[PDB]
Structure 1
Amino acid sequence: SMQEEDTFRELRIFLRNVTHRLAIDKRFRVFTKPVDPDEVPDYVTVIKQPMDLSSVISKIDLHKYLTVKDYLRDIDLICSNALEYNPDRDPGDRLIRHRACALRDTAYAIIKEELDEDFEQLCEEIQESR
């Protein structure tokens, strides 16, 4: 219905807003474009589902997230790809691992403070009925 649209438009705007607060943050700059294949050749062999804040944005715009839960799962993938790819054997590794976790935990904290539970519930029921 019209009212379902209203709801997803509202969702999309909230998701853009969150992604961009993540993206302007200095610590998270390295998550704002795809790991470049030509510049990191074996990434693709280890990491099967690549994800970064730019492709999250396109996905919002192509209406791929009907819930916040689905959006969070993609932010979580950004983090876990990074923990999975990066060895954990020194301070640079340590820096990047800490930023991935920070990204993930910052996304949760923002959603948690700002997302009305009745709004997400309504998003979930609309998806469950499709």
Structure 2
Amino acid sequence: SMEQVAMELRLTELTRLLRSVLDQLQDKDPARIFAQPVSLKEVPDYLDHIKHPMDFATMRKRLEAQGYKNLHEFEEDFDLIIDNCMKYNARDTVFYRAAVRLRDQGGVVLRQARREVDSIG
């Protein structure tokens, strides 16, 4: 149907916007601390601590399969990246501090993305 097609075009346009958001969020992580999943070879106990791991590569895979239906879903995954890190790592670590900085800087990007997604519908 043409209605299905139109919905598919909206999904595609959202996907384009979210890819630009994701690039912008990831530039706020110049150390690439959140680039890839936590390695179970190097933190074998990780899953005893963190129930839903997340990282930028995993988000990017979801994005390219047009797997985010709205901005809320994408933000949930971004928040997992930060929140997981702040639970697993202590306050005095480079990891926790990088999460705090990503959160603060990403909030600005997400504030306007919310306006763009509403605005362009």
Q: Deviations over 1:29-78 (max 9, x none)?
A: 11000011101111121011110000001111222211111100110000
Find the counterpart in structure 2 of residue 106 from structure 1. Answer: 105
Find the counterpart in structure 2 of residue 31 from structure 1. Answer: 34
Q: Name the TM-score, length of structure 2 as normaliser.
A: 0.83
Find the counterpart in structure 1 of residue 90 from structure 2. Answer: 87
Find the counterpart in structure 2 of residue 3 from structure 1. Answer: 6
1:48-127 matched pairs, under 5 angstroms: 48-88=51-91, 90=92, 93=93, 95-114=94-113, 115-116=115-116, 117-119=118-120, 122=121
Q: 5+ unaligned residues in a row in structure 1: which ranges?
A: 123-130
- Bigger mean CA offset, 105-114 vs 13-22: 105-114
Q: What CA RMSD, in Å, does the superposition of the two structures yield over aligned residues?
A: 1.8
Fraction of identical pairs, as percent: 29
Aligned length: 116
Distance 1:26 1:50 in 2: 17
Distance 1:108 1:26, change over 3 A: closer
Give the letter aligned to residue 48 of structure 2.
T
Q: 5+ unaligned residues in a row in structure 2: which ranges?
A: none
Distance 1:76 1:35 in 2: 16
Distance 1:62 1:22 in 2: 19
